[PDB]
Amino acid sequence: LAIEITTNSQEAAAKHEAQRLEQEARGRLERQKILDQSEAEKARKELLELE
């Protein structure tokens, strides 16, 4: 049971790491996406003028 607690603790901080990196992902990507939609709008305005 003493390896068990250390085996589970490996599992633990591993899962916790994964989640922090998952947030790295979504936190970055959701920001890239805004900075895309905004780059599109800088064009969409011009288009909307011609429209």
Binding site: E41, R44, K45, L48, E49, E51
Partner: protein, 50 residues
């Protein structure tokens, strides 16, 4: 919000510019038309008196 601006305004500007151009014609037309009503209903009124 700037696109929202260009869309909304640009639309109603396009739209009122339409109406405005329409009645601009009609007004220039009704002057010509009332000028013809003039000579017509006054040559009609002329040999009406005789």
């Amino acid at each position: 919000a700037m696109s929202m601006a260009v869309e909304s305004t640009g639309n109603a500007k396009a739209e009122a510019e339409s109406r405005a151009e329409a009645a601009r014609i009609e007004g220039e037309g009704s002057v010509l038309q009332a000028k013809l009503k003039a000579q017509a209903l006054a040559i009609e009124t002329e040999a009406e008196l005789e």
